[PDB]
Amino acid sequence: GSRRYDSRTTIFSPEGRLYQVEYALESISHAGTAIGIMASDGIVLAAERKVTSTLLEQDTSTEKLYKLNDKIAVAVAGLTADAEILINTARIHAQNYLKTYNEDIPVEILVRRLSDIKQGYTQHGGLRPFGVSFIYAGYDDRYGYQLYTSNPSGNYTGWKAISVGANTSAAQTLLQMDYKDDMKVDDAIELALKTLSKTTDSSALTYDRLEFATIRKGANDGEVYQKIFKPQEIKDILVKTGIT
Amino acid sequence: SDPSSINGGIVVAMTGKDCVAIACDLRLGSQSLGVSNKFEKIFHYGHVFLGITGLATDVTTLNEMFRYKTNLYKLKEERAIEPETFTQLVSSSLYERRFGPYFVGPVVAGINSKSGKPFIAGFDLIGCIDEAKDFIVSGTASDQLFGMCESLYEPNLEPEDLFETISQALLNAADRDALSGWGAVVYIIKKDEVVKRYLKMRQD
Amino acid sequence: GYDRHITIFSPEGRLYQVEYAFKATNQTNINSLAVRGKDCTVVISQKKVPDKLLDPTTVSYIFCISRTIGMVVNGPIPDARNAALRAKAEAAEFRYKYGYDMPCDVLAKRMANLSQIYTQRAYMRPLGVILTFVSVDEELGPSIYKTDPAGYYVGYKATATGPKQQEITTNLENHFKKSKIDHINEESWEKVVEFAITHMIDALGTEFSKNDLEVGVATKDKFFTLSAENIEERLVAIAEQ
Amino acid sequence: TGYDLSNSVFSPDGRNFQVEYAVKAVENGTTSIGIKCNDGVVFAVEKLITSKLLVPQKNVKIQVVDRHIGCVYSGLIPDGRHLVNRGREEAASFKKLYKTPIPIPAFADRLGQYVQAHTLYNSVRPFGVSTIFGGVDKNGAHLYMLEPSGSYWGYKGAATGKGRQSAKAELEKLVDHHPEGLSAREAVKQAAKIIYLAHEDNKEKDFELEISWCSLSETNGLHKFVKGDLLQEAIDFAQKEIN
Amino acid sequence: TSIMAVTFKDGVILGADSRTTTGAYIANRVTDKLTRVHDKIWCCRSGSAADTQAIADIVQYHLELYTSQYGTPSTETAASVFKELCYENKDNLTAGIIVAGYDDKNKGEVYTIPLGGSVHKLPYAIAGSGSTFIYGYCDKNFRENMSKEETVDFIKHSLSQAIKWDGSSGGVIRMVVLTAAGVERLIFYPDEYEQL
Amino acid sequence: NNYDGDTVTFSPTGRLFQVEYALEAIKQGSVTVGLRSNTHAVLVALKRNADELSSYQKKIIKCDEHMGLSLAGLAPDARVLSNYLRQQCNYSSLVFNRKLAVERAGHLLCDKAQKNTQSYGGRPYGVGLLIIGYDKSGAHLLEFQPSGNVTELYGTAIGARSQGAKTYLERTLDTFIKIDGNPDELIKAGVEAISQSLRDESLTVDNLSIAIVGKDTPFTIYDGEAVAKYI
Amino acid sequence: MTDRYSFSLTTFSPSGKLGQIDYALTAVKQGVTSLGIKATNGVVIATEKKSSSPLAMSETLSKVSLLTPDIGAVYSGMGPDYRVLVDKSRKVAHTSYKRIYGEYPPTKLLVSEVAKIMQEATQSGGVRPFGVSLLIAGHDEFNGFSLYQVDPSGSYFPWKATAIGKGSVAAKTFLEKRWNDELELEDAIHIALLTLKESVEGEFNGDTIELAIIGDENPDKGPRFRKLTSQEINDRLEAL
Amino acid sequence: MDIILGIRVQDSVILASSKAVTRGISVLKDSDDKTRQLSPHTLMSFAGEAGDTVQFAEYIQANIQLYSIREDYELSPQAVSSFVRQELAKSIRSRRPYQVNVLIGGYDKKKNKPELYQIDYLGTKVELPYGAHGYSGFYTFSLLDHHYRPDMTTEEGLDLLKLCVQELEKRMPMDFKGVIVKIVDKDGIRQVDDF
Amino acid sequence: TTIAGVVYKDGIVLGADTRATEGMVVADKNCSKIHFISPNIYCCGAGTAADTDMTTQLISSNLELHSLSTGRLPRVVTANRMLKQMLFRYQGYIGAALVLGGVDVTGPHLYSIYPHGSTDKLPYVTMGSGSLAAMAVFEDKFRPDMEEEEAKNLVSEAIAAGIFNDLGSGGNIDLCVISKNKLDFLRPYTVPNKKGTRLGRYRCEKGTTAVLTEKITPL
Ligand SMILES: [Cl-]
Ligand SMILES: [Mg+2]
Ligand SMILES: [Mg+2]
Ligand SMILES: [Mg+2]
Ligand SMILES: [Mg+2]
């Protein structure tokens, strides 16, 4: 019957690894590098687009940075379509929580939910896992500014600074070198862009190959504001930090 | 017994020159017993305002439901929902409970951000849209409001003239209804400013 | 090499099971032809009764789907009858739901969409048949629409299907290159049937008796098949000029 | 290769090898036949006597569907019973809705579509029987034969099983020598002969003859088994022709 | 409603009035209550208009699909499909249907299906609210093997009386003739049938 | 070989290997005999023990007052099929006030076994059954194979070394069929028949299992000292 | 009939490749060339009507399909797969949008819905990916004119101009030289016809080319989607 | 059940709930505690249909305790009240609705404020300085309307509560067998054992 | 409500009043009751309004999808069937009462659809609370094969009868003329009543209303 054709996506190897999770991680290693850096007064999300062309409409384009609600955003590394399935599920969970408790969802509770969905695809159902790794940048009134990552296994961890996608080994060393705990957002913006500029497989880092975002508690009247940077604004910050 | 008159209360909305107004009383009761004088019946999702009269649990539930839906709308559409679009969403959402409906009287008010056109609308409990340019009324003193609005209203009123018209329409209607009153709020809505005024009225 | 057993992509972007279903199409070794008149649509098909023990009246690959729609099948009879029963069901459901007779091209599209599903879903195999639907549509007039195991379909001025389809196709192409019109300019269906048989004779290089052919005719408000004697009358007229 | 391991897989030829393998199980079975006569049909089958311990006339092979249709098959006997059970359900639902007993061509397609369905998926095995069936309806007598692929046609005479070639040759003679037709009583006699002649392919073990018939004049268009004197008369006629 | 079907020498004729009422208001005075389920199998409808229309459409579908597979259905087969629907859904239906049809083998046949969903094969049948007033008349005046003209007169006179006495019946008398020759529609206006 | 992985696959010669392997489980099972006259029907079964401390596995199961069987092969499959027969016998009695005909019982068992040979995921039954009964047409003996093939016989045997008992019955056919109105002599013939399948071991008091049904005899099983009379 | 294919038929290989998606993209590569160009006051989409036989009436086969009054779609790859996507896209535009909001979806969201359907055929049990790449052109009030590509994986990207299928690599180079941000719709149609001529072997006329635009409203409001006639194409081939 | 009162003062919320349980003819108990601790700083009193009241209260308790363990965090009174309202609002269109009315008295440790929520069986939520369910408000609200101040001490709140209970004991036909009184503040929940 | 339709020589003429009520109160004096089904087919609605509005919208949407697939204009019988079968399924619980009129490839057709799922095919029909007043005008003056302006006037005269004599009907008169060559949507076709004139201005002067507190938030 049908058994003949079944790849068995939810089995252990003899070494106790999940084949499909490992191979999905291999896929993610070829995706454009995404970086998240947490500062005392905000969070930076920077990400590099892949295989850009001149004829791509950049100002209406979104492949890396997505809004989950007004307080939480994500940077994507992997299959964009797979990411959008999960993103829409996360957006719903946040609104379910808001409806139930009349409070914005704490960052970790959303992260755990998405990570649990990813976990399920590795333990049951016989389906391939989601080929996506997320960096979650968010704020709530319990833990303040938070960075998390999740990968196809459904494991998640918290970070002060982190990278996903291509050249994470190199990227993480550079972040580990220059990151300090008392760092501010404007400094973190510079660190993120400098790290991408050195780890990129492209010849030079330009505005058309980047997506950029900041979550700053600072706002007039102390409200958290998410800023997805426009193409011209990325171009300005590249000049300001002295990369172009 | 009648779910639409257990808790009581009213909403009225009006159009003016480059503006709209929406207003409501503040009463919540259990039939004869007054329970709350701070039960606001007007909510907003971006620049679109929604008033809801009727059974108070459904008022609250529908507010929570439309906040949910307009939040997801905004995330997907990358823009705030417009009054015309929202009106259709309310109608759809009410009619999907055709045979177990929410006992409510919604009223939409807002200005279309692109055309600048003032917009107001109303619905029956199962979603039929009352789409009228002059005024929309709802609640346990809807008859009283129809009477006040029909005689006080005239077209193209300036924001502060319109404030006086809608306020007097609300106040005097509420005072002829046992189940309405206990305070009142009036929103004056222009293309990029909204003024919210609480009115002084009799507390019986 | 399990990409050849089920309907998933090979490294070349091909579906081998679909391709092999096309080959099953010719297993009967029968050729069919369809042409359009002014007021009619004619379909002819070879009839071969190799066994003397068979009841020749029950050996048929032409199906009366609805009153207006006829369907000839090129392929094995089990899959032909599978497709025939489904098309009949679909045509009846359509008339009930939408209050008018299912058009030929709308049925064709529906059956093509079903066939597409078998090329995408693994548990279902393709049917090893090519379906040629014929009618005189009330809006489009004389109509020929053909469906295959890939889920492809298109309308035709005329068409041919089977092992020797190319010979028939080129013969028809050459005629329509002369006349410069999309149909057989003839009043009576009897003469359009005569044209269809004559041009099959020319293309295949074989003579036919009354029992070697099978004919279906679509007119306004009915599709019908011809008896052996109705075909004989047709063959007599061909021989007499 | 591997195209023959799974049902519903097309080989590069455009063939379903699992259906062709089902045919081998049919070819391995005992000889069964069908003869269409003037106002009806006759069915006959070879029943191999494996042992003296088999109770004579008890292991009945031919099966009735509704009251007017006879079914006989060669190959895997259980698969045939399963098909007849379905046939009986199809005939019952037809009569429930439409009142009239199922016409034979209608009934043929019901079996046909069901057998064909078992060639569409790898989760089922094709039927390991060829089924000869028919009877009398409002339009007269009809004889059918249905193969593991779902293929069926109407027949003047039909034969399947190990002795089918022998049987087919005998049936072809009858068709040629009787263009005007064969009577029901003649067809019973001829059916006996043909099974006896076809028994040369299974000559090791002796056998038991079983015959049934539906005829408008002889059985009122109902399916009945040939029993007693009429059966013995057909056996005697058959035994005389082999000697 | 006043409806009837009558077998005669050459086949069968169906007859009906054209009045449809909502209480005392005549919502349609020119209603067609003789409905076609197959070429030469028609029915007369009484009861809920929604129900009998729904049923008749389902039957037409069943017989169309029957025809595609098995050829022309018998009138008995048509009646059986009507019965099946009426009997199995008796709790949710108000439908009194007369089924009439012409075969060449069987000739003219009439089947009546009253409220319960029972079937009764009859030489002729009457139904609808107005039928009560013509049981006496129809029983006294019906003969078997009447001519076409005699049967038209019998139906015309019968429904004339049913219309005269039943307020729920009225308007034109429609008829449908079913013979080997084909299908003929007839209509008779008030000024004709009232003076009978 | 390549065609024995599941029951849904024919071999190139039209064989079903999973069914044939299920048939093999019966051959490994202990011998049991069935035989009948015109008045009575008898089952005899050689029960098998695990060792000298263990009990002897029961071989005969009662299905109704007028019907029961003996098993050879997978005993849990016999439990499933005998439970199904109990239910079908019971349904016939409750709904129709009718004792289930032995021939119809055979037909039901055939069809139940067949479904497991044509569908993916399942497996064939791994047991053979000898069904005896007395119904409105007298005494009956059936042989069930998990292929689905059910056969009505005067006598038979299944299990290991069953060919010896089967040959004996084939010789004795004319004698034992005539043993009418004498239950003890019919059982004697069954005990003598099963003895032709023994090697090394002989019939002891806790080894032998006998059952009988007849004209004025409900289906009753004899074990222990009740069968010492026949040793 | 138990659909036992409850498991994924597209899985990750050791290198991190999703084989079936790659192979689907190969099927798209073999497909006939189609392109899209965005102007300031419109969008144009175009493709070749590769007729399988001259006896076939290629007008009855529509490669360019209206999805909503203001959105159109063209493809490269497997035609039958495209047809069912168009049917689902038309339907989803009503069920998940128009019946809720009383208006047609904006281009980007309808693209998102099609993309979702394609992604699911890449992960769900017992199915292969769709063997097509779509080019979806459209207009809506708040986003203006837009052009999107959708691939077998479910990934989608917005374009100023692009091409897919047979001669896409050459065609994309041709478009890079000609495209600017000041093109009028007629200029974009002209460039579309020039680009498409390079990848067409045989006859090049209004009967062998299928071309549609998203532009001004054609008189609630008029539809912006308009399929150009055979004659309208031939008129612009004289000024070529 | 019968009388449940609530009053929010400066720095605490006080809930007073009757002790009687009557099954038709007889008073079966005179010491019944019509309350559940949902979390360390959140108390819910309840009254309505027999069985449904305790079943509902314990179900809510279980869910809040589950939340507390999962997140290692105490939900705000507002969050708990919204959760409770949703469960009641869900209930009202069910096959068999929970006929239960509640008061939720909580101390918000983040805002350092006491909060009182009144929710009826329909899911009608209101935040109030003082509240009641059934007929209890009819007798007591005129006294609370007169005397209540937002800056009252806990002791002044208990005295105003005594006056409310005295009025109830005078004019109500039913003997509700006095009230158990509980105070919710920054330090948690405690019972006043002499009232 | 008074809604009506007739079949004339070249097509269909539909008519409707504009009063929408809540109890005995008029909520909207200019409500559009003629609805689009497809480009060649329109619906007049009476009965429960939400039901009429939703049922017409749903069938219109499904017809649109049908028409995209087939590539031809939809027919009135298919609109009739889809409405009829849905209404029948809901057993009168969807209180949609419609006048459906359009022009096909097979010509002009007019139906009345009832909540329980019965339909009548007629040359002229009326529905709503004003049906009798409207029908009296039709019985008085209808003839088959009228010219366009004659038919227009008859429908308008029929709706007027309902407006004046039925308390449940009022306001303006709306028409929809459908033929092969055109679709004319006339809103309003006639205004038979002037809005009442008010003799005084009762609008208050600024500062008359007593305000507790105010807040201004910009956008
Ligand atoms: Cl379809
Ligand atoms: Mg008041
Ligand atoms: Mg008062
Ligand atoms: Mg497949
Ligand atoms: Mg009368």
Q: Enumerate the residues of chain E whose CB falls inside 8 A of the CB of residue I119.
A: 53
Cα–Cα distance, B155 to B175 (Å, whole number):
25
Helix (H) or strand (E) segment spanning residue F103? helix F102-115
List of residues 6+ apart from F99 with CB closer than 8 A: F64, F65, F66, F89, F92, F93, F135, F136
Cα–Cα distance, D135 to D62 (Å, whole number):
13
Q: Do the chains contact at G99 and I64, CB–CB below 8 Å? A: no
Q: Measured between alpha carbons, how far apart are the two ends of chain D, in Å? A: 51
CATH class (in words) of the domain with range A1-244: alpha beta
The one-character DSSP state at B182 is S
**Which residues of D are known to be catalytic?**
30
Rounded distance from Cα B55 to ligand 3 centre (Å): 19
Alpha helices in H72-195 (DSSP H): 77-91, 136-147, 154-171
Q: Enumerate the residues of chain I whose CB falls inside 8 A of the CB of residue G87.
A: 69
Q: Enumerate the residues of chain I whose CB falls inside 8 A of the CB of residue B167.
A: 209
Rounded distance from Cα B25 to ligand 2 centre (Å): 9
Q: Do the chains contact at E74 and D100, CB–CB below 8 Å? A: yes
- Please tell me which residue of chain G has the smallest CA distance to B86: G101
The superfamily in CATH containing domain F1-231 is Aminohydrolase, N-terminal nucleophile (Ntn) domain (3.60.20.10)
Q: In the complex, which subunits touch A with 3 or more CB pairs below 8 angstroms?
A: B, C, D, F, G, H
Give Cα separations from E30 to C203, E189, F44 (angstroms): 60, 11, 84
Q: Do the chains contact at G100 and B88, CB–CB below 8 Å? A: yes
- Spell out the domains of chain E, with CATH numbers in brackets: 1-196 (3.60.20.10)
- Spell out the domains of chain I, with CATH numbers in brackets: 1-219 (3.60.20.10)
Cα–Cα distance, I179 to E185 (Å, whole number):
30
Count of beta carbons in the 10 Å neighbourhood of residue G118: 27
- Please tell me which residue of chain A has the smallest CA distance to F121: A1
Closest C-alpha to D83, from D150, D173, D11, D168: D150
Asked if D171 contacts D34 with a C-beta cutoff of 8 angstroms, the reply is no
Burial of E173 from C-beta contacts in 10 A (0-12 / 13-18 / 19+): buried
Size of interface A-G (CB pairs under 8 A): 112
Q: Do chains I and H have 3 or more beta-carbon pairs under 8 angstroms?
A: no
Cα–Cα distance, F212 to F40 (Å, whole number):
7
Q: Enumerate the residues of chain G whose CB falls inside 8 A of the CB of residue A84.
A: 112, 115-116, 119, 154
Structure tokens at G48: 């070749």
- Spell out the domains of chain D, with CATH numbers in brackets: 1-243 (3.60.20.10)
Residue boundaries of the structural domains of chain F: 1-231
Q: Which of A100, A140, A142 to mutate to test the interface with H (most CBs of H within 10 A)?
A: A100
Q: Do the chains contact at D112 and C78, CB–CB below 8 Å? A: yes
Cα–Cα distance, A209 to A197 (Å, whole number):
11
Closest C-alpha to D153, from D161, D165, D145: D145
Q: Do chains C and A have 3 or more beta-carbon pairs under 8 angstroms?
A: yes
Token pair 């399924």 is at which residue? I89
Closest C-alpha to G83, from C130, C79, C74, C147: C147
Burial state string for B114-147 with b = 16 or more CB within 10 A and e = fewer than 16:
eeeebbbbbbbbbbbbbbbeebbbbbbbbbbbbb
Ligand nearest B175 Cα, by number? 2
Asked if B172 contacts B148 with a C-beta cutoff of 8 angstroms, the reply is yes
Cα–Cα distance, F139 to F215 (Å, whole number):
8
Ramachandran category for residue E128: left, alpha or beta (phi over 0 → left; psi -120 to 50 → alpha): left
Strand partners, C35: C42, C158
Ligand nearest E21 Cα, by number? 5
Asked if A1 contacts D8 with a C-beta cutoff of 8 angstroms, the reply is no
Closest C-alpha to I124, from I96, I157, I163: I157
Token pair 């072997």 is at which residue? G201
Cα–Cα distance, A209 to A112 (Å, whole number):
31
Rounded distance from Cα C7 to ligand 4 centre (Å): 4
Q: Do the chains contact at B75 and A67, CB–CB below 8 Å? A: yes
Amino acid making up residue B83: P
Å between A229 CA and nearest CA of chain B: 14
Cα–Cα distance, A233 to A99 (Å, whole number):
35
Q: Enumerate the residues of chain A whose CB falls inside 8 A of the CB of residue C6.
A: 5
Closest C-alpha to B199, from B167, B166, B165: B167
Give Cα separations from A112 to A106, B11, C191 (angstroms): 10, 42, 77
Asked if D81 contacts D88 with a C-beta cutoff of 8 angstroms, the reply is no
Cα–Cα distance, G149 to G115 (Å, whole number):
10
Dihedral, D103, D108, D111, D116 alpha carbons, nearest 10: -140
User: What total of structural domains would you count in chain H?
Assistant: 1
B104-111 and B118-123 strand pairing: antiparallel
Cα–Cα distance, B179 to B27 (Å, whole number):
8
Q: Do the chains contact at D98 and E79, CB–CB below 8 Å? A: no
Å between D126 CA and nearest CA of chain E: 25
> Solving technique for this entry?
X-ray
Cα–Cα distance, C116 to G127 (Å, whole number):
12
Q: In the complex, which subunits touch F with 3 or more CB pairs below 8 angstroms?
A: A, D, G
Q: Enumerate the residues of chain B whose CB falls inside 8 A of the CB of residue H93.
A: 100
Q: Would you call G240 helix, strand, or coil by DSSP?
A: coil
The one-character DSSP state at E145 is T
The one-character DSSP state at C119 is H
In chain I, residues 128-147 whose CB comes closer than 8 Å to chain E: 132
Which of D3, D121, D154 lies at the smallest CB-CB distance from C55? Answer: D154
Structure tokens at E63: 């017989």
Q: Do chains G and I have 3 or more beta-carbon pairs under 8 angstroms?
A: yes
Q: Do the chains contact at D98 and E69, CB–CB below 8 Å? A: no
Alpha helices in I71-98 (DSSP H): 76-89
Q: Do the chains contact at A80 and G155, CB–CB below 8 Å? A: yes
The one-character DSSP state at G211 is E
User: What total of structural domains would you count in chain B?
Assistant: 1
Ligand nearest D10 Cα, by number? 4
Q: Do the chains contact at D53 and F170, CB–CB below 8 Å? A: yes
Distance of CA G189 to the CA centre of its chain: 16
Token pair 């809720």 is at which residue? G100
Structure tokens at D204: 């090791």
Asked if D59 contacts D76 with a C-beta cutoff of 8 angstroms, the reply is no
Token pair 């046909």 is at which residue? D112
Helix (H) or strand (E) segment spanning residue I6? strand I3-7
In chain G, residues 4-63 whose CB comes closer than 8 Å to chain D: 4
The two counts, helices (H) then strands (E), for chain I are 4, 13
User: Does G177 touch chain D if contact means CB atoms closer than 8 Å?
Assistant: no
Compute chain H's Rg from CA coordinates.
16
In chain G, residues 96-115 whose CB comes closer than 8 Å to chain B: 99-103, 106, 109, 112
In chain D, residues 2-61 whose CB comes closer than 8 Å to chain G: none
Which of I84, I92, I120 lies at the smallest CB-CB distance from E31? Answer: I120
Structure tokens at B169: 């329409």
Give rounded-to-5 percent helix, strand, coil for chain G: 35, 25, 40
What is the torsional sign of CA E135, E139, E140, E146? positive
List of residues 6+ apart from F195 with CB closer than 8 A: F165, F203
Q: Do the chains contact at C122 and A5, CB–CB below 8 Å? A: yes
User: Does F2 touch chain A if contact means CB atoms closer than 8 Å?
Assistant: no
Closest C-alpha to G60, from C104, F58, A125, E41: C104
Rounded distance from Cα E25 to ligand 5 centre (Å): 12
CATH number at residue H106: 3.60.20.10
User: Does B62 touch chain H if contact means CB atoms closer than 8 Å?
Assistant: no
CATH of domain C1-241: 3.60.20.10
Cα–Cα distance, D113 to H59 (Å, whole number):
56
Q: Would you call B13 helix, strand, or coil by DSSP?
A: strand
List of residues 6+ apart from F56 with CB closer than 8 A: F47, F48, F49, F206, F207, F209
Cα–Cα distance, H48 to D107 (Å, whole number):
66
Q: Do chains E and D have 3 or more beta-carbon pairs under 8 angstroms?
A: yes
CATH of domain G1-240: 3.60.20.10
Alpha helices in H72-135 (DSSP H): 77-91
List of residues 6+ apart from C207 with CB closer than 8 A: C201
User: Does A6 touch chain F if contact means CB atoms closer than 8 Å?
Assistant: no
Cα–Cα distance, C198 to F229 (Å, whole number):
92
Asked if H88 contacts H119 with a C-beta cutoff of 8 angstroms, the reply is yes
Catalytic residue among E1, E20, E35, E151: E1
Token pair 């199962």 is at which residue? B126
Cα–Cα distance, F193 to F42 (Å, whole number):
12
CATH number at residue B41: 3.60.20.10
Å between A131 CA and nearest CA of chain C: 21
User: Does B65 touch chain H if contact means CB atoms closer than 8 Å?
Assistant: no
User: Does F120 touch chain A if contact means CB atoms closer than 8 Å?
Assistant: yes
Q: In the complex, which subunits touch C with 3 or more CB pairs below 8 angstroms?
A: A, D, E, G, I
Structure tokens at C153: 């379909």
Cα–Cα distance, E194 to B99 (Å, whole number):
49
Helix (H) or strand (E) segment spanning residue G118? helix G107-120
Ligand nearest G5 Cα, by number? 4
